[PDB]
Structures are given as C-alpha cells and as structure tokens.
Design a protein around this ligand. Structure first.
Ligand SMILES: CC(=O)O[C@H]1C[C@@]2(C)[C@@H](C[C@@H](O)[C@H]3[C@@]4(C)CC[C@@H](O)[C@@H](C)[C@@H]4CC[C@@]32C)/C1=C(\CCC=C(C)C)C(=O)O
Ligand SMILES: Nc1nc2c(ncn2[C@@H]2O[C@H](COP(=O)(O)OP(=O)(O)O)[C@@H](O)[C@H]2O)c(=O)[nH]1
Lengths: 99, 666, 208
RNA sequence: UGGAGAGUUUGAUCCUGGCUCAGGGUGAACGCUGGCGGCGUGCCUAAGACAUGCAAGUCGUGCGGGCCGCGGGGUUUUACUCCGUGGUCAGCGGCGGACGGGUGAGUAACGCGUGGGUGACCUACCCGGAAGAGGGGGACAACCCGGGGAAACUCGGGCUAAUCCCCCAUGUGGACCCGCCCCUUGGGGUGUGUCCAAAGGGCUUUGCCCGCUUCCGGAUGGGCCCGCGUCCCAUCAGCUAGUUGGUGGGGUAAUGGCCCACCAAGGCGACGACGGGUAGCCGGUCUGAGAGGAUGGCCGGCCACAGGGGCACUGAGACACGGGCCCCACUCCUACGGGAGGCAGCAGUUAGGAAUCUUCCGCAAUGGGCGCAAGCCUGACGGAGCGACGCCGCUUGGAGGAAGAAGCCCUUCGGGGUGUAAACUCCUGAACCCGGGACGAAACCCCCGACGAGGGGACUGACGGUACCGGGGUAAUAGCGCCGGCCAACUCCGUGCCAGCAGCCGCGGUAAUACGGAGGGCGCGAGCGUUACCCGGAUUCACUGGGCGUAAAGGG
C-alpha cells in the first residue's frame, strides 16, 4: 500500500527548511550592507559585508549554495559596495574588499 | 494432511416456494459454521462453510417463483437439499411444488420449518400437509417448546435431550433438560422414530421387539440410510431469524445428508454414442461440468463448476468437448463467506469457480486436454411460457436493444429473443410474468432502452366464400408496342388449409404457350396483400379457362398484370372472410381447479375438446384464437394457484365472427 | 513433404523419362516405355503449340522434379545461386547437386532419390562421423559419406552396395564398396551431370 | 552483374491514352484444411477506464533506543531485566529511489540528423596527485507521559545518540573585489585585503580497511549554441509588443528579453512568413535496374509524456512514472468528522476492434542499487506458456509389382482414362518406450602468499531429469486453389439471360473447355486461397526518362 521513501520527503522538508533560513539570512544581510555602502557608511558597511561574505561561503559548504553560487554573489556584493563607496568615501576599515 | 476425505463433503441446496426463508436461512448458516472469531449476499453461486470437520457447499437461489429451471439445474449437480418450509403459512397452497420437482431428478432432502415463532406456526399442521399434499414419509425429529410466541427451546426425539434458547440474537442457548410437562409427548414419537427407522435396519427392529433400545449410532444409520433412498424426510425446525434450531439442524446435515459418495454416478457419452457412469474418483479422466457464468469486477468472467472425475489443477489446460475448444484454466477458486480463498485444485465432487475460459458457456463438459473427449448429460429443456411485444421506440433505441440481448442472452440462457419473421416486432421469451418483467427494468435501465410493451399480432389470412369468374384484360393499343394481354379465370374457395391450385384450362391454346408462366407469377403475386387487411390471401383454387392475345402487342409482362387483375378482383367480388389462427392447447390441472379452468377457457372465444386424465391431475384439450390466448400463463396459474400447466400448438386457420370483421377494418 | 503418390506419371508428362523409382524404370516399363505420353483422359492427342511460358515452366518442373524437391526449397536455392558469385546456371546445379539425399543416391547407396532420402532420414548415413538425417544437408568439398554401423549389414545396403562393384560414380566422387565410404572429390560440373534439362530456360523463368 | 510484358476504342489500321493483370512485401487479419520442432514475433483501434499481486531498495563497520532469542545475571527467588553480540521494529542519519522498464499523446521544432563551438558551464560514484582531519557548543525523532480518533493517523509536554546541525582554529590550497603580467568574449597568473575545510567507524587498535575535508588532473555523462537537412494547403499573403535591438538589474552551473524597468522603432515574409492539416526524428525497412518511391513494427540512438493544467521543494542530477503542493475530472473506504489514490512497469480485467498471449518459473547467468563483506532487493533480465503470425528443417514411407483387377469416367462401344496407383511382396522404423543425461558456473568467498601478480580450494542451474545419447520400435496427418484468353491445366451431365461468374475483355438466352457437379488435369503443399495496405509493372509527374498544329496541353 505504501513505501518508506517518504523518509526522503520528511528530509526534503527539513533541509529546505534549513537552508531556507541561512538563505534569507544572507539575503537581508546582503542588503543591510550595500544599503550603507551606498548610504555612505564606508567602514561600518564594509563590516557587515565582511560578515555576509562568510555566511555565504559558509552556506556554500552544504547544499544551499555551491559552485559559483557563492562566488557569483560575492563578485557582485563586494562589487557594488565598492561601486558605491566611490561615491566619495575612501574605503575605511580593512574590510573584505582588497586595497 | 488429508483434509479431503470426500465422505466429509456436503453439497447442498436450499429450496422452497417463496416467502419461506431460503435466503435468510443461508446467511444464518453462514455465521454459525463460521463465527470462528479467534485471537489470531450469496456472493457467487456456491459457497463453503465448515460444520464440524465437514466442508459444506451451499447454493441458495431456488425461489420456485414461476421460473424454476435454475433450481432444477443446481439440483442436478448438488447431492443434498433442505426444503425450507414456512411454519406459519399453514393453509399453505404452495408448500408443494418445490419437492415434487426434486424426486423429479432423484435427490435426497430434509425439511426445515422456519418460522416456528410467527403466528399460525403450527408444526404438525405442516405434516398434516407434507403427507397430504405431496405425500412423502417425513419423520418428526423435533418438538418445540412453546408454539409460536412462546418459542424457547427444542427437543430432539432420537437423542431425547432438551435444549433452549434464551434469546434471539444467537447467543444464550443451552441444553436444559425437559421442562416438567412436555416429556410424555416425546416418548411415543421417539418410539415411532425408532419404529420408523425399523423399516430400514432390521437390527433396530428386532431389538425393538425384544425390549432393547437401538444404539444412537445404528439408529442414525437407519434414518440416514432411509432418507438417501428417497423414502423418508427428517423434519426439523427453528426460527432462522431468532437463530433457533440452526446449530442443531447443522448437525442434522451431516448426520443424515448424503455425502458425494453416497451419490449415484453421472452418465456421460463417448463421442460415438454410448452411456457411462462418471466415477467420482479424483484419479480418473478429468470430467467436470459447468453451470453458471458470472461477471466479476475483481476477476472477471467466472465459471462455477462441479467436478465428477479426475482433478483439475490450477494453471493447466482443459478441453470443452461441447464446443470443441481448448481452454487454458488459469486460476481455481472457492467462495468463502467473506473472502476469496484461492485454491490450487479441485478434486472430483467438489465445487467452485474457475477463472479464464471464454468459450465455455453453461452446461459445458470439460475433460482433460487429451482425455477421452466426452460429454455429460445436463440436457434440460425448459422452454418459455409468456412473451410480449417490444417495439424499441424510434429506430435509435431499436439498437440499444440489439446489444441488450447480445449480452443478456449469454448472461441468462433461460430465454430466447425472436424477431417475428414476418413483421419487425420482437418477442421476449420468458418463463413467468416477473421473469420478463424484471428484464424490462434492467433492459430499460442498465440499457436505458425505452420502448413499447403491447402484445403480439396475429397472422391472419384472406380468402373468400363464394367462387367467382371475372375478366382479365389489359390492352393498351395506341401505336406500336401495343401491350395486349387478357385472360379469364375461375376462382373457387377451398377448405381452410387447401393451399394453392391453379388450372391450365386452356384448350388448343387460345392463350399462347410462352405467356402462361407469366400469367401465374402475376396471379401468384397479387395474392399477397389481401383485399381486407393486406394478408396472404390463401386457400384457393384458380382456373385459367380462357383469354386471348395479339400477335405483336402481347408481352410476357402484359399478361402478368391481366392475371394479377383477375386475381386482384375475384377476391373482392367473392365476399372476403378474415381467417385467423387456432391453437391446440392442453392444460394439466388438478380437476380441483378444473371447474373454473374450463370456464375461463370457454370465455376465451374457445370450444372444448376433451379431458383424458394424467398423473393425479387431469388434462383438458381445445382450440383457441391466438388473440384471446395471450398471457395465458398468468391466467392458468391463477385458476390453479400454481398447480397448472399448458402447451400450445397451431393447427388451422378459421373465419372470424363477423362482428370481428369490421373490428379489424383500420 | 517430398510428394508421395504416382511417380512414373511425372516420368511421363514432362515426356522425358525419369528414374523416380530407380530400378524398375530401367525395365521395359518406366511407364513412358509403354505409353510415352501425358496422362489424363485426353493425353494422347495432337497437342496445341505451347506458349512461351509453358515451355520454361516445364523446364523448371523438369529440373526440379528430378531432384524431387519442394518448389519452396527449389526457389530458395536458385535465389541463392543468382546472387552467388559465379555463372548462375552452373552454380544452381552445383548446390542442387550438393544435397545429402542426392550425394547418397549418387553414391549409389540408394536406387532412387526417393529412397536415398529415407536412408538419410533414418540415420543410415553418416558424414565425417556425426550422422546426418537432413536430406537438405549440403556437402562441402572434402567429406566422407558413409553408412552408419548399425546399418552396414542391412539387406538394402548390400544389394545396392552390391551392384556397385562395377558401376561408376561421378568423376567428382570416389567410392569404396568395402568400407561403404565415399568422398566428395569436387563440386560436380556442368557436363558431368548429363541432364535432359536446360538451365537457361529455367532462369528466364525466374526473370519474369 | 543490371532493365520482359500482356488484355481492352475499329469493319479493318495506326497513334494517343485510361483502365486492368501477373511480381514482391506484412506486427497482419479472414476461409477451408492443420502433424513436429527450432528461432522469431504477437493491442497496429480507446494516450479510454482499470479489481489484484509484484514491479526499489539497502547499510548495525554511522547513532541512540523498543521487542525477541543467547551469555552472565543483577537481589536472597522473577523483581527497578544491566551488561557484550546477532535477529528484529520502526526512528535517525548514509547512499539509491533522476538508471533501468513503458508509451507516441504532443511536437514541423536546434525535437531529430549530422558536423562543430563553448574566453558561456556542470559532472554523485570511480582512478591519479597534494595537504589535512585541532578544539569546543547544539538541538529532534526514536523513547516516556498525556490528549483527539471509526479510520488514515494526529496534537502537546520532556528527554537523548551519531558520519545530524553549529561556532572557533589551521589553512597545503580554493573563493571574491583592486593593481600589474601573459593571453585574447569571462583563459592563465601574481601581490594587498577579505572569506572557507572537515566525521567518525571496524580491527587483530599510533597501523591497516571503510570512510571524511580541500585543491589540482583523469574519466564518464551531460547543459547550452550554431551551419546545413527535416511533410500537404495560397481557395492561408502579409505577420509581429517582450515584438527586434539597447542599458542596467534579476536569474542560472552557464549564454540569452529567460524575466523586470526604462529607452530606440525595429524584427519576419512568395527563397513562402503568418494561418490551417498531418506526423515523434534517425540507424534502418520494403520495393526498384538504377534514380527514385514508400516506410519508421521488433532491435539500437535521441526526444517527449506519465490522469488533463499550474508549481516549486530536496538534490551532483528532477521540475521527478510506483515524491510533493494547488485547480479540475474520475476511483474508493467512512463510526460521513474526514481519509486513500493514478497499470503508457510485469500479468491480467473491461471497453473498443477484423485482431494481438500467462494475474507463469528463476535471481542459475548477465546487469543494476545498498554493504568491508556475508548478503539483501531487482516483472531489468534469463527461461517456460498459448498462437501455422513469420521464417528455417522434418514426417505421413522406400524397393518391387499387370500390355494393366475393381469401381468410376469417356466411348464411334473397337476401346480410352485413373495407373504402378491399388493389391500383394519384402524393408526401414516418426511417434512411442525402459535407461543414461549436460554446456551455460567461476568467481565474489576462503587459504598460501604481501588482503599485488600468480597458485590452490569450496558453495553455486530457473529452463530441466529438458536438449542430446544407447537399447527397444508400430506403415504412421492432407490439404487448398485452379482448368475461355492474359495463364500452365478439358471432357461428360445438368442448367436455359435462370441460377450464377467476374481482375480486365467478357460467360449464361436447350447440345456452355467461362455457371453448377463429376472424371480427368495443372500448381503448390501443413498449407492453399481471399481481403486490406506499400513498391513494381507505370518513361502513367518522365533528373535519369515524357510532352503541347488537329490527340490533353501556347497565356488575346
Ligand atoms: C440471489 C438468487 O439466488 O436469486 C435472485 C437472483 C436471481 C435468481 C433473481 C431472479 C431472477 O432475476 C434471476 C435471473 C434469471 C433474472 C434474469 C437475469 O437477470 C439473470 C442473470 C438472473 C439470474 C439470477 C436472478 C437474477 C433472484 C430473486 C429475485 C426475486 C425478485 C423479487 C422481486 C423478489 C430471488 O431469489 O428472489
Ligand atoms: N419472523 C421471521 N421471518 C422470517 C423467518 N425466516 C424468514 N423470514 C422472513 O421471510 C421473508 C423472506 O425471506 P427469504 O428467505 O428471502 O425468502 P425466500 O428468498 O423466498 O426464501 C422475510 O420477510 C423474512 O423476514 C423467521 O424465522 N422469522
């Protein structure tokens, strides 16, 4: 009548539910960063972005993200942020963005 | 690991005239033999149930109701049978029948008195009938404590113990000794019993005379050895609804009811022609009969079969000799009271259903796929008795109907469909009102076909009284292919049932040789649509005694018309008379009912012809008009409550009462 | 199955004598020896000239009747020789000739092909060891046709094997009456087979 | 190494030209016959609906428990039942359920075929190479207790294990932005900054086995693009708004209007757009001298779809055939409060139809998943079954035997035929018997070795007591078509334009090789005939290979 493969569904649900979160985590955070960066908060933006970054490659370990999933995100994050901090700010603190 | 000794097998049938308790009786039997309940619907013809290390097959269905036929079929296969009787229905006119059509075949059967709780429930009354009507030799086997409303327990004479039933849900039973009074009543019947069994076992006779009492084991042997011969019929009892007398009648089963082996062999025929017994040896050729096909949702087409010889195996190969067809039996199967026990083979004497087979319809004899290709008996011949006109409304429905019987004829070969070979309308051959009636529901519902239900027509005939002679001229002479034909004939009426006679009354040959054939095909022809209604003008002699011709004008055709004219008018002129069909019918009826029976027949445009007795009954013969002869079934069984039967044959045609001449002018 | 039924009939018809029987046809009575003419009721009458078709048919039926062999089989082997590399005419005979049931008769183990085939069937024959029972077996060049052992001393074998001391066998065959042997030297050849049959016709016949 | 024609317009002729026939081929069906066996092949119609069973699982060498059989019993006897291990039950976690198998509905299209491009990418498992595996926290099932239930199950507390999750570390080294270098669509470097590793089991226990982590390569499989090739209809002629391009964003493994926003008016079409029908494409198949025509069953490749539609989740992979969510349709149980579903898997049921099979045996082999293994699962597959459905082989007898029985048929009554046919005579002996009886199966495992080579050793057959072999061994199924010409094969009797035949031309109207029977004959033979469909014949769409004064055909 039935098959124990829903075991797979039960999981299907867990995992989704997991990464669902670190997913939306980095999301919001990704934003809080670039927000500042643009707003002018030179270093305190760099800060957050330094964090976001981690949380990303961090997520990339598992199955949430992967391949360039992360690296793409980054090449945009610490792309635009430096592309908003040039709105007259001079990269303050030694956040991720390299000299 | 035997579980099949055969002498442990009980194939039985529940028969009886309606009302009774047949059906309800069965489901009950199927709750006792299988209440089981351990800390571990007649769902298809025959079913198995176990009662004290004995496997029983039951096939409740009888009904009596008009159409027996089927009853008389299971009957042929089964070995024993319980003729349920309704205690209550005591001025019982229909307790009969059922049986008198049992000994008909030759099978043993015990009695059961079902409603010993319902009003008029008077045991004896029945016996004052079961020997007065049919007249068997029953033997009282029980005496109920509390007639009808006061239904409590029972006593078995043979075994002189008293039982009780404290309720009717089927729980609080018990074997409580005889209650004060009654007792005495017993004795005597318990002596007669033994006295009755004396007529079988001499042993139980001399010991009767000496003063010694017969052993409960030799006493049984008597009773049993007496039933089996169709001499005696053990009568028992109990409200089947109150769950009473059953668990005890269940014993009554085995203890007296025949085992496949006490049964007399079926005869079968070689492909050449010669009888021969078919031995119930589960090791001889494989011969099994079939008896009932059924469409299952779950497994599909099912062929319930009664094995006689050899032993079928699940997933083998058979051979229906009947329709010389090589079937591949795939699956074997036994019907348990609530599930489908898939067995692996069926040894001679046993019953169940096989799945597979497509060409095996009813009554088909199945042997082994190499065995001597033999065919059993089975040949029963119960034709129909009541039919009706069915015109399938607009030609649309006329089709749904075609399928209607194209599947309904296979799903019930107790009928026949006939399209009046002269005039569209189709008859529905039945065997009793109800019969055809319930088909009118299925055939009209499950087929959604919606048509008309009148009665057949009658094959009337045209002729005349006075003989006449008219001219047959034709001629059309205008300018070339003249068309010149003329003849004169002599028309003369003939005895109803004379036929067709013409007369080459032409001398030298005033009417050239080449044309006569043509003047006959013309005359012959015309005689088709009567001068009155348009019916076969017949019973006449025609005399061509004159007529001329033209050398050039005449035509093979010109003559055919001229002759078709003399005919088309001599009838008109010699005063036409609407002949109709008369039948020969013979009603077998107990001169009891006869009185009115004859009446009825007289008030039916018919005139009596005699009555030379038959059986214990009496036959009456006479003629009748098919018109006032329709649905005679439900009229003969009226004047006779069932005890009536008739036949019918055509014989001649004959003139209508004139008042019925202008009747037909429509 | 290989026909069965009146033979020294066909002997006739084709009007070109055949030894379907073997011995007897030799005697004054191959049928055609007595009444050399197509059978039936009519038979002996001035015959209308045959058509272009009738002709080739009869040459086929002749060639095929000789080897006694189902048109089916007959056709297959032709439809084989054609595509086969080599002058088709010859070729066709070539295989036809390599039938075991034939090689047997040729070898003289059997008075008639009718007979030879039965022998073949009943394993009275052997090839290089393993007996064969398929008349249709096709002999390659360089095989020993011998009589089985259980057989060897069975009347028939002898009498026929007997008249063999003397009688020749095809330049393509070498026989040893003692050991009841016989090799298939080479693929028989056009002339080697002296037949009252014309292959060209027949071919033309399978060209329509 | 390859090409056949013939019947039919007339009084006669020649031409043109239609019609017709013989040939092959079939997943076939139908008729009348029907003996054996091998290898094939068997829903072509309703992608209509479907009872039942089985078609996907497996690891205890990842982890904690419940129950049950063993050790030793905890206590003084069973008690609060602990302990080490092997079954089990489900729960965890690990892989596998995306392969395999089915089907042709859709689709005229980068779907397919082919041949290429990825400075536009991905690849679990498997090889090779390099470096590692350092610390801490942390919950949820299982379980207990408790509630609601007919049922499916469901809700609430509280524990706890791990190769489950999570933080910090170290980073061989990898990811990003910036600068420079080579390069040339995003490819390789290189420095600053910044960010990220990990898991533990078994044993014989600092050493192996199996795992883990990161990075580089190998391999295999893919994603995507592009040129060319891929049907009928102009009595479908114009089509287009995310429409064509652009910038920036999103999105992805990755390119891209794949999406969003905004700008620009562009993009396509008689080289046939758009619209409408039909169809899965190819290897191949049949036919054909060839070109060419048809075709696409089984087998192999690719695609698509799994009731119809929409959607995402998990994941290396899927928008998932036996997963999930919503709409809709159908199917079922119901204590009617609410549950359970999808045979185009294997087999079968029903309906439809002219028609297409067994709810079969075996995991013996091959092949697949999980496991260190033993081993488990495997309707994949290997076999059996029914069917002249096809093909191939074989048999119903062989040799004698009359100027030639009989019967029957024809007769000019002389006789002619059936016909060596029978008879009769010998001889071989299918079937069928007793007996014997496989190959497919040698590894995984285990032992020497070094758990490498190599050597030895053990357990392994569904078919199957089948094939096949030796001994015995009886004369042991024939049909069907046709007999005017094309076309081989002719007489008698019936019949009288009747009944009937018939592909064509045409037969039948009292002496018919054309109807119907008989005798006889011809062809073929477990088959013979018919009916569908495709090629051929048909140079009758002509490239090969045709034509237009009057035959059809020159446009005023
Ligand atoms: C269950 C059984 O054994 O009999 C049942 C079933 C029954 C024998 C039925 C009577 C009659 O239809 C029978 C026929 C021939 C009716 C016609 C078809 O439909 C047949 C396929 C069917 C077979 C059995 C059936 C259907 C019964 C009756 C019917 C009585 C009717 C009334 C109005 C009381 C009965 O027994 O009373
Ligand atoms: N009261 C009562 N009724 C009974 C009993 N047996 C049968 N019946 C009634 O008989 C009637 C018909 O029953 P059934 O067995 O179907 O009749 P059958 O089919 O003609 O035998 C129903 O009304 C039942 O209630 C009984 O023992 N007691």
């Amino acid at each position: 009548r039935n098959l124990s493969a829903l075991k797979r569904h039960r999981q299907s649900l867990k995992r989704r539910l997991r990464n669902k979160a670190k997913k939306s985590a980095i999301k919001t955070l990704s934003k809080k960063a670039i927000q500042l960066a643009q707003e002018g908060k030179a270093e305190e933006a760099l800060k957050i972005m330094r964090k976001a970054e981690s949380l990303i490659d961090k997520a990339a370990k598992g199955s949430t993200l992967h391949k360039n999933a992360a690296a793409r995100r980054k090449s945009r994050l610490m792309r635009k942020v430096r592309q908003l901090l040039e709105a007259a700010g001079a990269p303050l603190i030694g956040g991720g963005l390299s000299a | 690991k035997v579980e099949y000794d055969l002498k442990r097998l009980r194939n039985i049938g529940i028969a009886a005239h309606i009302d009774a308790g047949k059906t309800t009786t069965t489901e009950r039997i199927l709750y006792y033999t299988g209440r089981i309940h351990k800390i571990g619907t007649i769902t298809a013809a025959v079913t198995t149930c176990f009662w004290k290390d004995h496997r029983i097959n039951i096939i409740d269905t009888p009904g009596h109701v008009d159409f027996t036929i089927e009853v008389e079929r299971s009957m042929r296969v089964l070995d024993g049978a319980i003729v349920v009787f309704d205690s209550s229905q005591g001025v019982e006119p229909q307790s009969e029948t059922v049986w008198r059509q049992a000994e008909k075949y030759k099978v043993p059967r015990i009695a059961f008195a079902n409603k010993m709780d319902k009003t008029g429930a008077d045991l004896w009354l029945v016996i004052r009938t079961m020997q007065e009507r049919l007249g068997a030799r029953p033997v009282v086997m029980q005496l109920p404590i509390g007639r009808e409303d006061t239904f409590s327990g029972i006593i078995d004479v043979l075994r002189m113990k008293a039982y009780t039933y404290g309720n009717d849900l089927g729980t609080d039973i018990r074997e409580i000794p005889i209650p004060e009074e009654y007792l005495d009543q017993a004795r005597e019947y318990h002596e007669k019993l033994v006295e009755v069994a004396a007529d079988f076992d001499e042993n139980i006779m001399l010991k009767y005379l000496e003063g010694e009492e017969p052993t409960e084991e030799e006493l049984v042997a008597a009773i049993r050895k007496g039933t089996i011969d169709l001499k005696i019929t053990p009568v028992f009892l109990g409200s089947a609804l109150k769950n009473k007398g059953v668990q005890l009648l269940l014993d009554a089963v085995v203890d007296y009811l025949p085992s496949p082996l006490d049964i007399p062999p079926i005869k079968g025929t070689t492909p050449e022609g010669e009888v021969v017994e078919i031995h119930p040896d589960p090791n001889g050729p494989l011969a099994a009969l079939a008896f009932k096909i059924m469409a299952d949702p779950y497994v599909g087409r099912l062929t319930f079969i009664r094995v006689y010889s050899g032993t079928l195996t699940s997933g083998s190969y058979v051979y229906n000799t009947t329709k010389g067809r090589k079937e591949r039996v795939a699956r074997l199967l036994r019907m348990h009271a609530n599930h489908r026990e898939e067995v692996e083979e069926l040894k001679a004497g046993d019953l169940g259903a096989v799945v597979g087979l497509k060409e095996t319809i009813t009554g088909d004899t199945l042997v082994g796929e190499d065995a001597p290709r033999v065919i059993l008996e089975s040949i029963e011949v119960p034709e129909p008795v009541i039919d009706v006109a069915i015109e399938p409304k607009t030609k649309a429905d006329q089709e749904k109907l075609s399928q209607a019987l194209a599947r309904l004829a296979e799903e019930d070969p107790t009928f026949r469909v006939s399209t009046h070979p002269e005039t569209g309308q189709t008859i529905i051959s039945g065997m009793g009102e109800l019969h055809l009636e319930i088909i009118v529901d299925r055939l009209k519902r499950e087929f959604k076909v919606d048509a008309n239900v009148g009665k057949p027509q009658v094959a009337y005939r045209e002729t005349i009284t006075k003989p006449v002679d008219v001219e047959g001229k034709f001629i059309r002479q205008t300018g070339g292919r003249g068309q010149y034909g003329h003849v004169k004939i002599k028309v003369e009426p003939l005895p109803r049932g004379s036929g067709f006679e013409f007369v080459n009354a032409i001398v030298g040959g005033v009417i050239p040789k080449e044309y006569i054939p043509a003047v006959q095909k013309g005359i012959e022809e015309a005689m088709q649509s009567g001068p009155l209604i348009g019916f076969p003008v017949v019973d006449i002699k025609v005399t061509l005694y004159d007529g001329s011709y033209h050398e050039v004008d005449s035509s093979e055709m010109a003559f055919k018309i001229a002759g078709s004219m003399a005919i088309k008018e001599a009838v008109q002129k010699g005063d036409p008379v609407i002949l109709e069909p008369i039948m020969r019918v013979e009603v077998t009826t107990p001169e009891e009912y006869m009185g009115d029976v004859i009446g009825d027949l007289n008030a039916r445009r018919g005139q009596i012809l005699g009555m030379e007795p038959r059986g214990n009954a009496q036959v009456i013969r006479a003629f009748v008009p098919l018109a006032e002869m329709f649905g005679y079934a439900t009229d003969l069984r009226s004047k006779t409550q069932g005890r009536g039967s008739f036949v019918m044959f055509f014989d001649h045609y004959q003139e209508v009462p004139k008042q019925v001449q202008e009747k037909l002018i429509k | 199955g290989r026909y069965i039924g009146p033979v020294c009939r066909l002997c006739r018809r084709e009007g070109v004598k055949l030894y379907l029987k073997g011995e007897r046809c030799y005697s004054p009575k191959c049928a055609m020896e007595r009444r050399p003419y197509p059978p039936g009721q009519h038979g002996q009458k001035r015959a209308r000239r045959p058509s272009d078709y009738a002709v080739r048919l009869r040459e086929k039926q002749k060639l095929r009747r000789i080897y006694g062999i189902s048109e089916r089989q007959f056709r297959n082997l032709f439809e084989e020789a054609s595509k086969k590399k080599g002058v088709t005419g010859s070729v066709f005979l070539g295989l036809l000739e390599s039938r075991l049931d034939n090689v047997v008769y040729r070898l003289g183990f059997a008075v008639s092909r009718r007979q030879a085939r039965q022998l073949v069937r009943h394993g009275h024959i052997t090839v290089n060891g393993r007996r064969v029972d398929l008349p249709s077996y096709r002999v390659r060049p360089g095989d020993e046709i011998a009589v089985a052992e259980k057989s060897r001393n069975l009347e028939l074998i002898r009498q026929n094997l007997e008249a063999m001391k003397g009688r020749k066998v095809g330049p393509w065959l070498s026989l040893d009456v003692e050991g009841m042997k016989g090799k298939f030297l080479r693929l028989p050849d056009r002339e080697d087979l002296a037949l009252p049959v014309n292959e060209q016709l027949v071919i033309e016949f399978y060209s329509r």
